[PDB]
Amino acid sequence: KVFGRCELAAAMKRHGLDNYRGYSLGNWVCAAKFESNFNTQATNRNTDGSTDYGILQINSRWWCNDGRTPGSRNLCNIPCSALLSSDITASVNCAKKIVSDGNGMNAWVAWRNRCKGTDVQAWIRGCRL
Ligand SMILES: [Cl-]
Ligand SMILES: [Pt+2]
Ligand SMILES: [Pt+2]
Ligand SMILES: [Pt+2]
Ligand SMILES: [Pt+2]
Ligand SMILES: [Pt+2]
Ligand SMILES: [Pt+2]
Known part of the structure; x- marks a missing residue:
């Protein structure tokens, strides 16, 4: 499935990612965007x-x-x-x-390089949550 931005935010929130280990929702959405482009079927060898x-x-x-x-x-x-x-x-x-393993969200290289220290709040902007 290819999620919309807010659809994925809400599903992440329902499933307990918002502020999980202190990472706000926008971090998780940003990671998903740049890791998979919101496609659940993404694979990369x-x-x-x-x-x-x-x-x-x-x-x-x-x-x-x-x-x-x-x-x-x-x-x-x-x-x-x-x-x-x-x-x-x-x-x-x-x-x-x-994310509990010791490096937090730095385990996602795409988070580290494209999300970390940015305005990740923008990724949940305009979403009913
Ligand atoms: Cl991983
Ligand atoms: Pt949908
Ligand atoms: Pt669900
Ligand atoms: Pt859940
Ligand atoms: Pt895009
Ligand atoms: Pt589990
Ligand atoms: Pt809410």
């Missing part, structure tokens, strides 16, 4: 052989099982395919484990 999946481009080296990432972990205990669903629940729960 890395040089290292792992793959990033879903609205928040969650990576198979650590977080999910795709069956083809040699030597990897599955810390969220899910198949990577679950991060592709139009229901963002699996991506939300995993992102919660990720």
